Ligand binder design. Sequence first.
Ligand SMILES: O=C(O)CC[C@H](NC(=O)c1ccc(S(=O)(=O)N2CCC[C@@H]2C(=O)O)cc1)C(=O)O
Ligand SMILES: O=C(O)CC[C@H](NC(=O)c1ccc(S(=O)(=O)N2CCC[C@@H]2C(=O)O)cc1)C(=O)O
Lengths: 261, 262
Amino acid sequence: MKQYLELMQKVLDEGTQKNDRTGTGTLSIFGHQMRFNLQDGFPLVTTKRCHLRSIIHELLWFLQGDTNIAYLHENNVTIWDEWADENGDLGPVYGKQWRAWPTPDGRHIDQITTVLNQLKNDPDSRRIIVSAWNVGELDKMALAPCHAFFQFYVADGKLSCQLYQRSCDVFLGLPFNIASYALLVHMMAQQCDLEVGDFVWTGGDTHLYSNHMDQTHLQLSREPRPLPKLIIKRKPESIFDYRFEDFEIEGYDPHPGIKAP
Amino acid sequence: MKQYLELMQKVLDEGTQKNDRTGTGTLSIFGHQMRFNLQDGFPLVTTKRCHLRSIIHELLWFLQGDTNIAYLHENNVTIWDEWADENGDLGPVYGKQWRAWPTPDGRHIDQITTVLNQLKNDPDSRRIIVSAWNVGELDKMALAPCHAFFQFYVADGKLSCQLYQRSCDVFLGLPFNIASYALLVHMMAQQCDLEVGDFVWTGGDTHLYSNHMDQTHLQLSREPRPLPKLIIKRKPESIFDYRFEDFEIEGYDPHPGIKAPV
Ligand SMILES: O=C(O)CC[C@H](NC(=O)c1ccc(S(=O)(=O)N2CCC[C@@H]2C(=O)O)cc1)C(=O)O
Ligand SMILES: O=C(O)CC[C@H](NC(=O)c1ccc(S(=O)(=O)N2CCC[C@@H]2C(=O)O)cc1)C(=O)O
């Protein structure tokens, strides 16, 4: 996508060499922002074929508050396999904080239900937020949240969302993360009778791993294609009732998938 | 400052006319990002006189974990007065979350100390973060955090920081918030023997209140002066041991103050 390819080029040109916790290098930058007007098309990278199937199952899994990979396993989505313990558990990662953030008195807070009620009853609210950054639960997680904090906003009947991503793997994670939040905006907009607005992406530590450099060079030699259009085929009773078969992507004409280690 | 006036101009050119929680109208945009290279000078707005005195006292108060206005009130800082209850309490706002976020199992996490240690021992960490957004306690607070989430980054011996401000009062709040975090970057850099890098400001709901519009256009008719300079005169034993008198600003020559209604 244009913005996505300018970000890759900027990391290559301006990133500083760093050594992560695995001893693998990265070129990284700090602080970046991109804006996707969702009325211009669904923001699925076209410079490499992305597989929406895994993006869709992961988001649905998030919304159910499940942190066990079984459901992902049942549908052949393997992106979380390496973090899962012997029982397939991840600890209280994304989903559990979105649906049941634990409070000290033993209660739980459902941020998604709060957000839907804020969108329907107080759309101008300046605090329509979901945070996965539960400081007191970080040590229990297989991984601290990367896409960690998001906010919704309503103007002229359009629903926008901004994500603060504290850590971004530009080649492998980003394409997935942008599509995931664009997807969520379409679903929330539908449940709230709103049109779609902008998806604003903000990055903190934004990096390209050293073993993604051939792939990055290959991807940057390709020209982006017009964005596809997302179709929701059925409007469920609630934001927790979507199914994989409800989504269709039309006009998606990507360059070939690019594998990365 | 150039970045600040450009943001004012962006809110005026693109903003959507809305109504704040109290009705008082707002002009707002959603999503914005700007950067201040702290070696260029301390980012204290020059197009209106700002008092750094209040900004300094508030930051030392945050760093102590204090949520009562007594300290501020004693030092003639009244910016939090309208939110305090009859005993001066604000609930577990900013400072409490920064220094003692309560976990489900009964522990408390001191996020400032955690960040200080991560900067000294693992400066390339990608999770050098402080969050004031404690979902479980937001409704006990007198106000939910505006400057809600921030992250540190280290490159070429310089310390940078990015703030996610979910709600921004551009005219009244912003000048204070920018100087506040820039001061905090200086203090942390001093404690870990680093140089200052950039302060990255990101906005969520970024608005100008309708009764700040003439003050905003008055400010927009002025030219930004050269940035002042920050001189810290001592190196305390910890990030929690700074004193008001340890900070001096030099070369601050602003245009005249502009009062406005909160
Ligand atoms: O689509 C598929 O089935 C997977 C194909 C493969 N994707 C990835 O490895 C991939 C995709 C997303 C991610 S992620 O950043 O959203 N993410 C989810 C798993 C943990 C990880 C994180 O935060 O570190 C991490 C890795 C790719 O080449 O895109
Ligand atoms: O010096 C003084 O007493 C303040 C005078 C005045 N400043 C402001 O009103 C001002 C300063 C800071 C803020 S703030 O956004 O940082 N903030 C701190 C008080 C509660 C408020 C909030 O979260 O809503 C909000 C307003 C100014 O002209 O800068």
